[PDB]
Design a protein around this ligand. Structure first.
Ligand code: MG
Ligand code: MG
Ligand code: MG
Ligand code: MG
Ligand code: MG
Ligand code: MG
Ligand code: MG
Ligand code: MG
Ligand code: MG
Ligand code: MG
Ligand code: MG
Ligand code: MG
Ligand code: MG
Ligand code: MG
Ligand code: MG
Ligand code: MG
Ligand code: MG
Ligand code: MG
Ligand code: MG
Ligand code: MG
Ligand code: MG
Ligand code: MG
Ligand code: MG
Ligand code: MG
Ligand code: MG
Ligand code: MG
Ligand code: MG
Ligand code: MG
Ligand code: MG
Ligand code: MG
Ligand code: MG
Ligand code: MG
Ligand code: MG
Ligand code: MG
Ligand code: MG
Ligand code: MG
Ligand code: MG
Lengths: 63, 136, 49, 104, 55, 74
RNA sequence: UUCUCCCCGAAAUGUAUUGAGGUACAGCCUCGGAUGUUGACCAUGUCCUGUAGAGCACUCACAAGGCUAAAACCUUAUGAAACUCCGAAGGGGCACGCGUUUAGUCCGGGAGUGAGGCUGCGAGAGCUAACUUCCGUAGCCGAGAG
RNA sequence: GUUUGACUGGGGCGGUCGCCUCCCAAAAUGUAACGGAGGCGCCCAAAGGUCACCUCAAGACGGUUGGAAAUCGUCUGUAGAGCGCAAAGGUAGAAGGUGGCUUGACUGCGAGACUGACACGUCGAGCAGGGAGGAAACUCGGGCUUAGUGAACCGGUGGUACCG
């Protein structure tokens, strides 16, 4: 069998072509407003390093 | 004896002393040869001995001074909270450092007074009259 | 109790807010600043809320 | 009176990158002006008014700016710094300016 | 500038070991002929107690 | 009365005679032990960073007042 | 936790953990591919540092005199982890090789280790005690017979 | 039916658990202890942008209330002050003290770097929209820096008009 873990689905992973793992930008994501303008602006990367193997096996087909 | 001063506790190691190898005040001087702590009552016993032998006369200088706190843990506990708050004050003493020096007393009586005072110090020590001197 | 609350400022007939902690000590009177909202250039945002 | 001199002199040679210096001296009736290339230890285009005379100091100095604007104009002077000495951008040195770069 | 090992690497610090290894010596009783250029002189100085420098 | 402390790495990061690319950080410091030189910029925490690529170089005069600076290649 | 010989060969560290004799990631091992001297040592050049020492110029402490409404201030004289007018030896980054050596890096499969121990040097805690304890550093044991 | 933490020179009682500063820390960075000291969970519509101006502690002599220190005057005076809170670095060509106009305590971005196992965290030229102060060069995307903090989930509110 081998189901993918659905927690990873719309959760900040996605599979870039060329096999790299996506992620989102988290800190101060919600509930904080003495954070600076760029900081609120700083979300949206997902390049993420030595975790990738596990993130991959979280999603077999990229759901 | 105890200073009226600052931070309670310290550390410890050693190297030969610099801050008083030469006898400025007075005529003669007993002088340390070993690197022990001296501390408080050890000195004060030196003082009280020499003041017995000499006083009514002479000038007594104590160039050394119990600067350094030393600690005792309580009683019988395990290596526990922190260090122990009190116990006794010491003066580190390195060879060539001058602790004592008399004034206005004949050579021989200074011999006997240094002998008495040094029979109750942890270090052995040697006396001298001042050679020629510089450092002014 | 509480002293210097967080105050949200509606822009002057815009659609966007800004939010900051105007201290309620000396700042007894409602905030009136200027800032760039959804549309034009800097305008008066009225930090009433 | 001192600190304002070195104050504006530090803020001038910070803002000085490319642009040349223009140090108006005003303490006397000598409202001399210079154009100094910071870096190179050189001036190139001074316009002192020891020979000129036009009346009140505010208007005498005016011509000094004009004299200077012609001199630097012959050398190919872009813009410049300004480098006030201590004098609070007042009508005589403000006039030396309006006269300098109105005619630049 | 003849050299040989005459004392083991073992139980000697790291720079001494890697220097013995640089100079070309991998066993006690190895010998070698080394130029006198400043860096080689510095190497053969760094571990001179391990080496019977000839002259 | 003991447990406390804290760990914030500081220091010179790009030493003289090194080729910094522009935007490189060259010193982290708490005050102005180094003053930003010709070609150098300093942020809120008095970090000095390259304004344009070049050779990093140090000017020392009296430890009240030394400056890091860039001498561009070419 | 059972058959053989051959090659390489660790860890007892870091950060996190209802975590502390467990586990994740990193670190260190091995294998295959790629580059292909970028590695190592030692030299020269350059920059950074506040330790050893020393010194009282500031802070605190402090010894004998002088002046004196005792404070300051003068001569003489000291101590310092949380003092420093000064300040090495060493140490770190970068370039270069002017010179010898032989690794290094990237990519992917398999790990184990995360209880360390002693001694010399540098400190703390402790009695300047411990086959003591916690860090730093070198080497051996660990897994090393002779 | 279950819950009823961990560290811990045995466990318990006591104490501690995140964050900042100094010594320890052996002149790079890093470095443990129920080692030695001390602070934070904020504050400020001005203590911020900018633009203009001023310069401190302390002592001596002289002077109304005073009577060692108040206020005023001359002299000396790298700082012996000040910097909202701790300490350290820094600081007088100010970051200190005062006034003017003001909000850049911005939107969309982010070359390139510091730092961390990760996730976080720091600095930042320069580009556009649009502003503020200055005559101008130019400075402004909060504060002299370093503490004033909380992933995710689940939800309140306002836009948007992607899904449905
Ligand atoms: Mg089936
Ligand atoms: Mg996709
Ligand atoms: Mg010694
Ligand atoms: Mg010795
Ligand atoms: Mg001396
Ligand atoms: Mg030996
Ligand atoms: Mg082998
Ligand atoms: Mg952590
Ligand atoms: Mg464990
Ligand atoms: Mg692993
Ligand atoms: Mg390989
Ligand atoms: Mg390399
Ligand atoms: Mg090489
Ligand atoms: Mg010392
Ligand atoms: Mg000198
Ligand atoms: Mg080569
Ligand atoms: Mg792998
Ligand atoms: Mg296998
Ligand atoms: Mg362990
Ligand atoms: Mg160990
Ligand atoms: Mg002790
Ligand atoms: Mg042991
Ligand atoms: Mg074992
Ligand atoms: Mg053996
Ligand atoms: Mg071995
Ligand atoms: Mg044996
Ligand atoms: Mg059950
Ligand atoms: Mg327990
Ligand atoms: Mg407590
Ligand atoms: Mg260090
Ligand atoms: Mg070191
Ligand atoms: Mg450790
Ligand atoms: Mg201690
Ligand atoms: Mg200012
Ligand atoms: Mg204007
Ligand atoms: Mg900018
Ligand atoms: Mg909604």
């Amino acid at each position: 069998p081998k189901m993918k873990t659905h927690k990873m689905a719309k959760r900040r992973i996605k599979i870039t072509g060329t096999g790299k793992v996506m992620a989102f930008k988290s800190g101060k994501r919600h509930q904080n407003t003495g954070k600076s303008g760029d900081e609120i602006r700083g979300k949206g990367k997902g390049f993420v390093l030595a975790k990738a193997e596990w993130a991959r096996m979280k999603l077999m087909l990229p759901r | 004896k105890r200073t009226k001063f600052r931070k309670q506790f310290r550390g410890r190691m050693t190297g030969d002393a610099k801050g008083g190898d030469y006898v400025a005040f007075g005529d003669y001087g007993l002088i340390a040869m070993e690197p022990a702590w001296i501390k408080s009552n050890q000195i004060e016993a030196c003082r009280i001995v020499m003041s017995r032998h000499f006083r009514r006369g002479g000038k007594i200088y104590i160039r050394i001074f119990p600067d350094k706190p030393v600690t005792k843990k309580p009683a019988e506990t395990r290596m526990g909270k922190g260090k122990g708050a009190v116990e006794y004050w010491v003066s580190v003493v390195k060879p060539g450092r001058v602790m004592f020096e008399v004034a206005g007393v004949t050579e021989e009586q200074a011999k006997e007074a240094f002998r008495l005072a040094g029979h109750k110090l942890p270090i052995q020590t040697k006396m001298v009259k001042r050679e020629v001197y510089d450092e002014a | 109790p509480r002293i210097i609350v967080k105050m949200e400022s509606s822009a002057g007939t815009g659609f966007y807010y800004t939010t900051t902690k105007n201290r309620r000590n000396t700042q007894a009177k409602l905030e009136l600043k200027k800032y760039d909202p959804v549309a034009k250039k800097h305008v008066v945002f009225r930090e009433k809320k | 009176r001192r600190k304002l001199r070195t104050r504006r002199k530090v803020r001038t040679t910070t803002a000085a990158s490319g642009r040349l210096r223009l140090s108006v001296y005003r303490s006397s009736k000598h409202i001399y002006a210079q154009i100094i290339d910071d870096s190179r230890g050189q001036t190139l285009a001074a316009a002192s008014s020891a020979a000129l005379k036009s009346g009140n100091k505010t208007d005498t100095a005016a011509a000094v700016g004009k004299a200077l604007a012609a001199a630097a104009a012959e050398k190919g002077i872009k813009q410049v710094v300004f480098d006030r000495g201590s004098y609070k951008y007042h009508g005589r040195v403000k006039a030396l300016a309006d006269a300098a770069r109105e005619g630049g | 500038m003849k050299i040989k090992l005459v004392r083991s690497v073992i139980g000697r610090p790291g720079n001494q070991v890697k220097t013995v290894q640089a100079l070309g010596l991998r066993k006690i009783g190895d010998s070698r002929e080394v130029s006198d250029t400043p860096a080689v002189r510095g190497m053969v100085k760094t571990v001179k107690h391990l080496l019977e420098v000839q002259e | 009365n003991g447990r406390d402390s804290n760990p914030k790495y500081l220091g010179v990061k790009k030493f003289g005679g090194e080729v910094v690319k522009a935007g490189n950080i060259l010193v982290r410091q708490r005050g102005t032990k180094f003053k930003a030189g010709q070609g150098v910029g300093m942020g809120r925490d008095h970090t000095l960073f390259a304004l344009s690529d070049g050779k990093v170089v140090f000017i020392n005069k009296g430890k009240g007042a030394r400056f890091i600076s860039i001498e561009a290649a070419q």
